[PDB]
Amino acid sequence: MAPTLQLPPDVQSRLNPVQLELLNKLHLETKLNAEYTFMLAEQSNWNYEVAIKGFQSSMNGIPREAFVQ
């Protein structure tokens, strides 16, 4: 389920269109569920390269539940 379909509008309200695009792109690439994709994006301070590098270097910290959806 694509993040922009799963996140309620009132949560998406705090985000600009390129942040929403980043969420969708990160979801398509990492296969994290929408919740954890959102968290990674937040943790990365909404920076794609930082998010991917963070993901690639913290894989062993991510529970299996993060990929379920």
UniProtKB/Swiss-Prot annotation:
Domain of life of the source: Eukaryota
Domain annotation TAP-C: ranges: 17-69
Intracellular or extracellular location(s): Nucleus; Cytoplasm
Coiled coil: none
Subunit structure, interactors included: Interacts with nucleoporin complex NUP84 and MTR2. Interacts with MIP6.
Other remarks on this protein: Present with 2830 molecules/cell in log phase SD medium.
Entry function: Involved in the export of mRNA from the nucleus to the cytoplasm.
Protein family (similarity comment): Belongs to the NXF family.
Note on domains (UniProt): The leucine-rich repeats and the NTF2-domain are essential for the export of mRNA from the nucleus.
Name by which UniProt lists this protein: mRNA export factor MEX67
Complete-protein stretch covered: 530 to 598 of 599
